[PDB]
Amino acid sequence: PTYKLVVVGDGGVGKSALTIQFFQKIFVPDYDPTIEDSYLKHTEIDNQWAILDVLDTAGQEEFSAMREQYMRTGDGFLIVYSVTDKASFEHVDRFHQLILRVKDRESFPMILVANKVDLMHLRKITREQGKEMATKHNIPYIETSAKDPPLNVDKAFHDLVRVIRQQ
Ligand SMILES: Nc1nc2c(ncn2[C@@H]2O[C@H](COP(=O)(O)OP(=O)(O)O)[C@@H](O)[C@H]2O)c(=O)[nH]1
Ligand SMILES: [Mg+2]
Ligand SMILES: [Mg+2]
């Protein structure tokens, strides 16, 4: 049993830092913005084991054969924005629309991820706005931090698996 998950969002919001924290349990700062890898691990979620196949998307400018196949065959999406980056929040609508267009569905497993909440002196998008926008798309909302010690990183990926299993 494999779940194919896709992490999407504007550049610089922490998709790589979240994915690396989830798989390798380390915080990698300033990770190369252009590397797009997928990662697989065998893990236990609610006493049910599964292989998690996670694509860390990078560089939506040019065509990515990797991203094309994961977007088409993916089982769930994490939509990440940074609470310190207003534009990454505003583009949540674009990613949401794109996922439903590719899947040709009125709804699909996704979770809205508000990252970098450890940066309390820089926070621009309030928790209210985030919950508002998740409510608007009728998807779950979770706040995360990839910096040690990490906040809700495992829970974000596991909750997406839970959404997929509860269809
Ligand atoms: N303080 C803090 N910094 C973060 C967090 N996540 C990412 N960063 C930093 O934000 C920048 C962009 O992160 P990155 O993982 O490369 O984002 P990506 O472009 O979406 O893959 C890097 O400088 C990271 O070190 C976080 O949760 N907290
Ligand atoms: Mg990256
Ligand atoms: Mg660690």
Using a 10 angstrom Cβ sphere, with 0-12 exposed, 13-18 middle and 19 or more buried, the burial of residue 72 is exposed
Residue 2 belongs to a domain: no
Rounded distance, CA 122 to CA 136, Å? Answer: 25
Residue 64 is labelled as binding a ligand: no
Please give the structure tokens belonging to residue 167.
């269809």
Residue 1 belongs to a domain: no
Residue 143 belongs to a domain: yes
Residue 4 belongs to a domain: no
- Starting at the edge strand found earlier in the chain, the sheet holding 110-115 runs 38-45, 48-56, 2-8, 76-82, 110-115, 141-143
Q: 3-state DSSP helix/strand/coil percent for the chain, to nearest 5?
A: 40, 25, 35
Expressed as residue numbers, the domain containing 35 is: 9-165
Q: How was this structure determined?
A: X-ray
Per the rule left: phi > 0, alpha: psi between -120 and 50, beta: everything else, 56 is beta
Which residues surround ligand 1 with Cβ inside 6 Å? 9, 11-17, 29-31, 33, 115-116, 118-119, 145-147
How many structural domains is the chain composed of?
A: 1
What's the CATH number where 111 sits?
3.40.50.300
CA-nearest residue, atom 3 of ligand 1: 116
Residue 132 belongs to a domain: yes
Contact 54, 157 (CB under 8 A): yes
Rounded distance, CA 110 to CA 132, Å? Answer: 16
User: Containing H/E element for 97?
Assistant: helix 92-103
Ligand 3 ion: Cβ-proximal residues, 5 Å cutoff = 25
Residue 104 belongs to a domain: yes
Residue 79 belongs to a domain: yes
